[PDB]
Ligand code: HEC
């Protein structure tokens with residue numbers, strides 16, 4: 001549903017997470033993020049123009065959303081187990097996924 005908007009959704013919900021008060025909020029943000037990541041994973045960034053879905057760049061692109069959903073799952077667990085700050089920290093550790101893709105395909 002538009003790659004810009006998917007990316008806005010991940011960004012945004014990182015902020016709510018840092019600012020959050022209780023796991024239920026954090027739980028909801030990570031939900032939004034996960035869906036965003038799966039939707040984004042289906043799109044074609046401008047730099048990957050006329051690259052066939054079997055190209056390494058488009059494989060690598062889709063791959064990058066896979067590691068990230070993993071780490072979002074791994075953080076959601078902490079959420080459902082009431083463990084806020086540790087999930088608020090796991091969330092921070094997600095910026096490792098953000099940087100790597102961007103530097104390649106933004
Ligand atoms: C590739 C597998 C990506 C990962 C993982 C993340 N981002 Fe991304 N982002 C990606 C691309 C290819 C682009 C450019 C889209 C375009 O319109 O050119 C972006 C852009 C953003 C932006 C800017 C959005 C805007 O208003 O134009 C933001 C704020 C952003 N991305 C955030 C973001 C965060 C917070 C991520 C980790 C949780 C993250 N992205 C991962 C590609 C990829």
Ligand SMILES: [Ca+2]
Nearest residue numbers: 002003004005
């Ligand atoms: Ca746009």
Ligand SMILES: [Ca+2]
Nearest residue numbers: 004005007008
């Ligand atoms: Ca924008």
Ligand SMILES: [Ca+2]
Nearest residue numbers: 004005006008
């Ligand atoms: Ca928008």
Ligand SMILES: [Ca+2]
Nearest residue numbers: 008009011012
């Ligand atoms: Ca905004």
